[PDB]
Design an enzyme around this catalytic site. Sequence first.
Site, PDB file in Angstrom:
ATOM      1  N   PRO A 106     -10.847   0.048  33.494  1.00 43.32           N
ATOM      2  CG  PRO A 106      -8.957  -1.603  34.311  1.00 43.32           C
ATOM      3  CD  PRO A 106      -9.529  -1.054  32.993  1.00 43.32           C
ATOM      4  CE  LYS A 110      -8.686  -5.402  31.476  1.00 42.50           C
ATOM      5  NZ  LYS A 110     -10.016  -6.145  30.526  1.00 42.50           N
ATOM      6  CB  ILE A 165     -14.188  -6.212  31.501  1.00 42.51           C
ATOM      7  CG1 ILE A 165     -15.394  -5.065  31.979  1.00 42.51           C
ATOM      8  CG2 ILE A 165     -14.940  -7.198  30.909  1.00 42.51           C
ATOM      9  CD1 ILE A 165     -15.588  -4.144  30.729  1.00 42.51           C
ATOM     10  CG  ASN A 178     -15.007  -4.455  48.880  1.00 48.07           C
ATOM     11  OD1 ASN A 178     -14.385  -5.271  49.432  1.00 48.07           O
ATOM     12  ND2 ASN A 178     -15.609  -3.368  49.259  1.00 48.07           N
TER      13      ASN A 178
END
Lengths: 114, 118, 118
Positions: B1, B32, B64, B97
């Site tokens: 990430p 992660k 992801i 975002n």
Amino acid sequence: PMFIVNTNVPRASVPDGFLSELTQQLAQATGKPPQYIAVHVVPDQLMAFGGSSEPCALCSLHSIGKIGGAQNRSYSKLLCGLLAERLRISPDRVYINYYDMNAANVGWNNSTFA
Amino acid sequence: PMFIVNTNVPRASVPDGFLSELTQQLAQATGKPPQYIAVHVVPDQLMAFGGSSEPCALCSLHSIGKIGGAQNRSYSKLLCGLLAERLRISPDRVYINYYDMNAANVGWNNSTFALEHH
Amino acid sequence: PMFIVNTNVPRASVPDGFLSELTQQLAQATGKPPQYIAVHVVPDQLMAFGGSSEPCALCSLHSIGKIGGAQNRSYSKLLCGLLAERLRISPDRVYINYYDMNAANVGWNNSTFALEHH
């Protein structure tokens, strides 16, 4: 298309010709004319990858089409190769986000590409 | 990430340990591995939120998977909390975002995370 | 909404009041209250457009809704006009990426704009 690379590598380490090499090689890779390729290089950034401040890069490539499985793997080999050769950044310390843009979602010259 | 924070707070106001705290807390939050978490902090920016130039931040988190309704609300509480505590930025002057990236659309290590079909 | 402008134009060439003008004009164009409009201008960048380093800009506009074919054509005429008038950048050297954000994917004030479901 537009390609952006943010990195903690110092500006002095960016070699003469880099923006031009990126422009020409991305034109070749994406099949788009070089006059429509935009590039933005951001050195000296405060960043970490895996908690380490060794050289790294966070990038993005936006294109209307020409974005997909095989194509993105090809772009990553090309771009990681350039970042390794020119900025001495290990490929495993690079992330590139790919965006397949809808033509209606890209503004240019007072209108959009739609 | 990858987590990016752009802010008008001065670089001098970023405390020692901030990048490491973001890395560790995002690893915990997303599940992660920390070895795959990247962070980028951009201070001293020319920005406004609501037309005012008091401290603010515009951020993004790309991952992801692990992006969704409840997870994103949890990430926002965590990140606004860190931005308030460490950079003294009010949570209501922060936008983040979130991007749920497809594996094929993330490059890394000369290829992407779509290694299953060719 | 959030609007970001990355350009190679020098900081001294960004007029005083530019962030405020963008805030006001975008509030008008999107119909969203100015209190919710965020703007970020990044001058002095190392960039090229078509292989040239003459003035150019790479931008993005993120909004929850109010993004579409006709609306984006209107935003482009508006924003390129402002970039030409204020920063002296030719509209054909400007790219603006538009993003229609889902409410659940925008964090703000310790949560997101998805407040309806759990």
